[PDB]
Structure prediction request, 1100 residues.
Amino acid sequence: GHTNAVQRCSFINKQKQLISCGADGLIKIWDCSSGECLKTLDGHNNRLWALSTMNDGDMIVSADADGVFQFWKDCTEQEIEEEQEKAKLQVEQEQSLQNYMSKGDWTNAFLLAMTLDHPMRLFNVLKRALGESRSVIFNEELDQAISILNDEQLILLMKRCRDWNTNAKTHTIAQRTIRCILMHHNIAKLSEIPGMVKIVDAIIPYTQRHFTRVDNLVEQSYILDYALVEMDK
Amino acid sequence: YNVGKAEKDGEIRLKNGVAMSKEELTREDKNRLRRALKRKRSKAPDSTNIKL
Amino acid sequence: YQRFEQAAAFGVIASNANCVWIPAPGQLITSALEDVNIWDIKTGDLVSKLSDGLPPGASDARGAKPAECTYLEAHKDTDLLAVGYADGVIKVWDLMSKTVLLNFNGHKAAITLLQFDGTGTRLISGSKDSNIIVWDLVGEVGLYKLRSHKDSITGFWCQGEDWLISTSKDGMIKLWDLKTHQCIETHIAHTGECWGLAVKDDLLITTGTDSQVKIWKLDIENDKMGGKLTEMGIFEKQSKQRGLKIEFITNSSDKTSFFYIQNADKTIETFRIRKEEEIARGLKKREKRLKEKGLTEEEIAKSIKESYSSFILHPFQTIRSLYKIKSASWTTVSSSKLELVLTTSSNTIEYYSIPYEKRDPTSPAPLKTHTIELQGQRTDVRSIDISDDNKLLATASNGSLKIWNIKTHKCIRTFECGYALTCKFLPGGLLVILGTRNGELQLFDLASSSLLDTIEDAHDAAIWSLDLTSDGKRLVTGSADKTVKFWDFKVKLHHDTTLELTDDILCVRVSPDDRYLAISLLDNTVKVFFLDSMKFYLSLYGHKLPVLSIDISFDSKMIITSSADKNIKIWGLDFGDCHKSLFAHQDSIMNVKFLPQSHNFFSCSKDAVVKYWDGEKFECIQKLYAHQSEVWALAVATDGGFVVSSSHDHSIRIWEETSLKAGERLMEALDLGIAEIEGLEAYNRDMKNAVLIAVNKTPEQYIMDTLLRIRMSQLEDALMVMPFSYVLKFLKFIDTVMQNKTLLHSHLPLICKNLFFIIKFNHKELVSQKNEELKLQINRVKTELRSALKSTEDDLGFNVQGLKFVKQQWNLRHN
Prediction:
């Protein structure tokens, strides 16, 4: 796997692995049992002649011909702990989301859905929160939570609203959410965020279509006003 | 603009405008969606061993 | 024909399932494949064996093999045992009646564990399908199904009815609220899978795959939305192998709790929860030591928390056996001594006890006082042979030969031996020949009850197959060394002649007439030697793989051969020609029998199936599937009545011959829901249905749901047919939709179109009606529809111009 000549080879982690340095300047960590490159380290721009290891390869010192030392520190347990914690945190979010939606705590469910990137739960949270909002835009707590959203969360939310807007059976939920954004944010900041405008461009033509509709639904309704005036005769 | 496929590999976006992230779908929901897609694409000698 | 039916199953002390122990020192119920076995520790013998029915081979019996019972669950108070099987069905057998009273089937897969509640009214059953069913004994049905687990449930704990803890092969603890019917809190047991879960008051111990075992404190009333179950400390058990199953036992007199971890390894480690006072002094001792070390006070706390788990639990002792421990269970606790029964993987159960005082147990090592090996063999029986009188059945396994009388079904004597490949019953029946993997021949005597003489150098390699002549004077031995040896008996055994052969002798096997001898070889050709002339006659050819068994018909004119290629060839003697080649078993056919004085033959294979064929027919009379694991050997009686087959799981087994149309659906939907509205209003006016209660939704919402179910394309004509007298009801319904503004906003467009298709349809007839109340309904419905439609236009409008603004502003900025 080395592009150029290998100048140094040292065992690390007892029998399990081997580290090799080559004239290409790239240090490769292999698995002795399987003979495959587990990791590649590239901290130099010249051939490497000397490779010193301490504590069974926990410390690796490699010197460049140019004169650069790279002091590599083993941290595998460190990253493995980190990914374990991230997995630990993620389950607490999905479970807390399930408990909130069953309880009806939409304001807290909204925040979890956005972080977890959960569309239908997000859509369900807004939809049934709106129904309660029927029963300023949504409610004081959720109107505050949406306001605190950062630029990344804002970008994610409107993309969902664009997709929701295209469907005439779900445009109503999208429009009220967009109204709260315009009502609870500085539109100047909304403009400067990159990627806003292009997603923003797509939602007028559907929004205008909904306006041509509804108004026709609105216009027709005076048939009832024709009905009552006919009774009055 | 027209809704297309999900930009993320971990989500299913239909032409209806609805997006479905895999992690949150129930197993029964995942099964029917897989079958729905399937319909979509369909029309589109050693001595010791022998005794022992 | 005559159907071969399975008379008696024996030789299995126990099977792979949890043991059930009760004190009368107690009585143990062991699993015996599909069948259930009751044993008594005091006598160390089987009390009774419980077969559900459907005897193997019967017409009613299912062709598929019966499933081994996955789990055994019995409530001592109710005196009923319940067993789950592999297909997911549960069978509840009463201890006294010893027969099924109830049957439950709610699991799509095999069941892991079965849990009786304290009252005994209902059972929580968890299965590999990840669905846990709460079966009510009186209801005989599952109250609710628990599926949040993504994988098999290794265990679950339900001491309290209101809250349940479940661990699963997903590796996850799930807190289940049985009122909610859904899991409230979920957390990772380990990065690997958790197989063992047990709880003692607040502390909850979970065993991951690797040695580390985590302890979780649970405060059932924490109700902070989180932290209901929280980690105290993680303690490394000595055994690397995962802890399958864990229990606590506590002594009331001394208030001392001990817990063992059932490691997948044979060693079983038991630990003792130090007294809370003894925990405190140990903590006060450790801090004093840590001060002597000179560690910083913060570091002192770090050592204490790491040693905190060690403070609660003290290693008590560890129980080691010769072989792997399949199951274990606390039997009793006494101030003098603990007791424990554990069932090994190889089908013997030993009852260990530990006398203890204060901290360190008095017994240096564990002692088994009760153990059973007389009905069961640790080693699978490789070769079985039947006595000429048929009274005595010989079963030769590695390290042991066991002889059983068919009528008694109890072992008469047991012989120590080696890894016996083949067994043969001497002439006259006072004796038995075995051949071991070491190559030393064995001469056994029934009368003396022991091996007479072992000829170490009789043969070089192992004797894999072995024969005897009809007269029995001459003994033929088959082996891997590629050399046959002929041995003759005298009132001493002398080796008459040696036959060299090119390839290893898979099967020496002899004819009754003693005219010719068949040889099976790894080169896939079966040569035939005349036994009298000692010269080679004919060789079978075309076997894809070597012949596992060779067979000569009663008339001696046919040679039936079963091969590792899984096909049976039947060669005629006169010309050595195969009449038919038959792929009988999906796995290889190890041994093949005759019905004596008949062309029929029986076969056995690693698939565990036994098949009965007829020579003239060349078809299989009957299929037999009783053997859970692979049948290693098959034997035929001299009488031919009873055919012995033995499984790999030590089962010794013997077979003996005996419409509403859309639009209209809206109409009655109006009638039912509207009729309720007048009833409610009439009840309201006074103070100043059964299906719907099952529906448990409001009448208007039910009418609204029906409206969505009706197709829009066939909506128009559906509204067309609808009579005007119903329209008054429809207007009244729409009036009731408005009273809940939320209901309208959910489906405002569909509601509007429908009211519109009505008014246009009946406008000329509607103006006829002069009822003032209808006008007030028409007055009311108008106002809020206008408000609702105006609000949507207001909200819909507000987005377009405002969003037009930002696009224009960005355009000016970036132009």
The beta strands of chain B are 11-13, 19-21. Helices of chain B lie at 27-43, 47-51. The longest strand of chain B covers residues 11-13.
